[PDB]
Write a protein that binds this DNA or RNA. Structure first.
Length: 91
DNA sequence: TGTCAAA
């Protein structure tokens, strides 16, 4: 089961295939997100990143490895979190 | 909104 096979399966309606991608990548994504947001907020941001990746998977062209695309989604989700945090903290 | 080398 390569990432590409799992992605193809999800794009064909096999939702549970995506759970294998989450199991494969959640530790890496948490580590990445922890570079950007406070430790207590990492799980929330990681969860959002994975939901966004899943819901946008139909638009993923496969012009990179899945993880390359997911990595950038995670970074940008963290960045959006920081913008929202700035607003809430009146920065 | 999009995020597509890899990381």
């Amino acid at each position: 089961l390569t990432d590409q096979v799992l992605v193809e399966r999800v794009q064909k309606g096999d939702q549970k295939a995506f759970n294998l991608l989450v199991v494969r990548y959640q530790h890496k994504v948490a580590s990445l997100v922890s570079r950007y947001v406070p430790s207590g907020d990492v799980p929330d941001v990681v969860q959002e990143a994975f939901i966004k990746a899943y819901r946008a998977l139909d638009s993923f062209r496969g012009d990179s490895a899945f993880y390359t695309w997911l990595y950038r989604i995670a970074v940008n989700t963290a960045k959006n979190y920081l913008v929202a945090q700035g607003r809430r903290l009146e920065l």
